[PDB]
Subunit: 302 residues, 2 copies
């Protein structure tokens, strides 16, 4: 099975590394650290034991790779205008596209660009900061839940789930990709939002009672927008308490958006915030706290 | 009003937060009386560090005298010392709050002093200690408060309010017994396996068949819980919820593993042998908890 990794980053390189370690033909597409990876290799620093890959099949242009069986898009979503130029040379009849990037609107913009039956969505729970050119730092978790965009057929999702399980990634299969994306949004929106804005890790947002109270209300707004979107099964309100207690054992974790704010690179406001808001306002649901958060966030960074 | 009987990684932490918000806190120190009478204790947290310049410390409980509340944070192998350590602190109206691990603690103190004095607190805290008078708080800290003998709310809500004022996320339940068993679902696989294998939680969770083991251990604890006269049944699926909860903890080394590393005794009796007793009393097959308890006393006998 041959794979393209379009994105790199903490997410793309980590799953890319684990795939070739379990014997899969993985073709990396790099920009920033092409010379530091082709000359050296990529080092994975993990809590489940470090490992290094001495040789890595690395490319700096998508046309050099050619058509692929699978393509992992782990890109940051501010470069979604680059979907056409980076993915087109990898598309053959039978090519299936996997997306692990945060928020909504990613599966939909790729289905319009290539085809709905090709699109597999993966909601990934990964604790990873990264990089002095060619290094990945695995800090926690890593589990994936796989779902197809066009909802119908069993074999492909199972073959992919087993493949990630062969690579040592905890992998699950679901019938409702929409719901699982919205379930991740319940954590993503308050915690990537408030933490990037206030420039404070999750524990300090959780330490104040009134800030906890804010978090709940953000979460309930997300749930309401989720529940009236066309879900096969309803997301209960108790899930707020579940995700609240979940984050309480993450310690001093700084989420991805906060790290981007600290590193001077742009933030994924469009996919994490504006798009769920657009989908929520499409069905006419009040989401004032999300909107306020979205606005302040793009005010803060410009 | 408050006496701290324990002076471990949790008794110090909670007592330091209690007097920081202006409570009359009296610490019973043993190993490090002289280090805290000279300098005071330093609390290092993820929620910002603080230092108490002066600490009301004592070496004998008869010097402290009658109290309003005694927080017991003792390690459960010192439970034979209940009478000598707590009796001088007890007057008519004194209430005893137990925050230690496992079972039997509420009932022992109830037999010893009076059941209408006893308050059970299931606490969840990540804390290693140890530079005589230095407390490290790595995460969480939330407490669920129950009364052993089920009479009133004011008493339990006044204590809950008192903790919340001090910055402790503090809840209240009507089923203390259930909540103890709820924490046993986590404490048995993880404080068990990690101490035995001498590995952190992420490794135990990394192998597929080891997750299946954890599942099985967990299901037994639940089965031993559900036949214990609980007001409301613990469902399985609470398994899936501690499986995913522990996965957000990264490279975490539980209290029992830390105690194994430092070569100090383990709380096998309260965490393992008492619940196994409670299940056998009702006749429940718990082969895995048994094997674990036993292998764990085999490794720490030598």
């Amino acid at each position: 099975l041959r794979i393209a990794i379009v994105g790199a980053g903490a997410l793309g390189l980590y799953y890319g590394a684990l795939l070739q370690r379990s014997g899969e033909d993985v073709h990396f597409l790099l920009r920033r650290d092409y010379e530091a990876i082709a000359g050296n290799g990529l080092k994975v620093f993990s809590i489940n034991g470090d490992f290094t890959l001495p040789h890595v099949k690395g490319y700096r242009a998508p046309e050099e790779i050619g058509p692929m069986d699978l393509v992992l898009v782990g890109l940051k979503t501010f470069a979604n205008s680059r979907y056409e130029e980076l993915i087109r040379p990898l598309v053959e009849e039978g090519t299936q596209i996997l997306t692990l990037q945060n928020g909504l609107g990613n599966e939909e913009a790729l289905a319009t660009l290539f085809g709905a039956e090709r699109i597999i969505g993966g909601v990934a729970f990964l604790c990873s900061n990264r990089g002095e050119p060619g290094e990945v730092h695995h800090l926690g978790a890593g589990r994936i839940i796989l779902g197809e965009f066009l909802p119908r057929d069993t074999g492909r999702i199972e073959e992919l789930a087993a493949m990630f399980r062969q690579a040592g990634v905890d992998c699950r299969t679901t019938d409702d990709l929409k719901r699982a994306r919205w379930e991740k949004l319940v954590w993503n929106i308050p915690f990537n939002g408030l933490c990037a804005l206030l420039q404070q890790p999750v524990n300090l947002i959780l330490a104040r009672d009134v800030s906890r109270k804010l978090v709940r209300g953000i979460m309930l707004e997300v749930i309401a927008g989720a529940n009236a979107q066309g879900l096969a099964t309803f997301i209960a309100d108790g899930y707020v308490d579940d995700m609240l207690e979940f984050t309480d054992a993450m310690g001093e974790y700084k989420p991805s958006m906060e790290i981007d704010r600290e590193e001077g690179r742009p933030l994924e406001i469009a996919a994490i915030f504006r798009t769920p808001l657009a989908y929520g306002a499409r069905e006419g649901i009040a989401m004032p706290r999300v909107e306020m958060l979205a606005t302040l966030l793009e005010q803060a960074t410009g």
